[PDB]
Paper text:
Viruses in the Hughes orthonairovirus species possess an additional 26–30 amino acids in the middle of the [name]. To assess how this additional sequence influences the structure of vOTUs in this subset of nairoviruses, a crystal structure of FARV [name] was solved to 2.22 Å. Thirteen residues could not to be built due to a lack of well-defined electron density in the crystal structure, and those that could be modeled possess high B factors, suggesting this region to have a high degree of flexibility. Additionally, the α3/α4 helices of FARV [name] appear to interact with each other in a manner resembling a coiled-coil motif. Additionally, FARV [name] possesses a potential steric hindrance to efficient binding with the presence of Arg170. Removing this region reduced activity towards Ub-AMC by almost 60%, suggesting that this motif could play a significant role in Ub binding.
One specific mechanism used by nairoviruses is the production of a deubiquitinating enzyme, termed the [name], that disrupts the innate immune response. Instead, the [name]’s primary function appears to be the reversal of post-translational modifications by ubiquitin (Ub) and the Ub-like protein interferon stimulated gene product 15 (ISG15).
Numbering used by the authors:
A (entry chain A), B (entry chain B): 2 to 88, 102 to 183
Write the structure that this text describes.
Amino acid sequence: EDINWQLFGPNLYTSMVKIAIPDFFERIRVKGDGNCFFRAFAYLFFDTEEMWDTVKGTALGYARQHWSECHGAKGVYNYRAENEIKSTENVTRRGLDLYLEDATKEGYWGGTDEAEMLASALNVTIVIWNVNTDMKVLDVQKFGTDSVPRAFNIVRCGAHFDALKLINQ
Amino acid sequence: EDINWQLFGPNLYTSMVKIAIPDFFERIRVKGDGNCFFRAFAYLFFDTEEMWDTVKGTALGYARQHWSECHGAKGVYNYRAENEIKSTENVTRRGLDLYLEDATKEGYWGGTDEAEMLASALNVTIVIWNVNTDMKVLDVQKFGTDSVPRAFNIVRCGAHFDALKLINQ
């Protein structure tokens, strides 16, 4: 059960451990729309999918205030912000604006960039297990330093996220 | 036929188009060792998987010269360098050296970090189709701006990469 985690970015770890999810977790399906990541985390953290919007507001509020710590989102949007200016205080400002313009839309697909913001915003550990259709682990990453049993575990299959709860606990 | 690509990183696109690979591509199997990504790309690009080593050399030589454009790999190795140092420019030089120390080993598993390098180094588009074990697409990434029929298409099933050729051409 002891898993070796290697450092992969700020507050971010990966592992090579390969398991079948169903032998340790119960999977809880959430609604298949563009908010599934927010619903899955809201289900584990607040015990209901219906708080996805609070989860989403928490993530975006954290970005507004700690943009320099959203390495996933800023990696994409700060790069793209430099390439509108020629068309370092003020690029990263514009990158945050571009991110917020996308993320505030109703159609936005939450995912791994927002998992990083929630883990820091709430001081929790979020594990994202990427699986195939047979629920076999293709890879796993983890924002935060807690162990898998002390963490909120999410499963990704292609574009869709669901929640996982550990069986024995 | 027409896929809508979402920007996902610098020169990196994603899509949730869902297909069966055998309906559009013939798949060409390459040797199943840690060089299979290089072998898959060498098969499409140079018509032989035995130029995998030139492909690898292309990717790593590109990284030596363009480390700051190697967004996937530099995210990992620049962070590891800056935590080695605690125990903006000295960091990234160390990060590249850490990357090369892993990547130049014969046992290194090439993959998306090097797809990004090859796409920029050679000015081509590489498409990575992640499939489950029955070859149904889970999701797909594209390094570069060309369309699927003008790109080098690679299928990935867990850790293993093979080449894809489009049936129509």
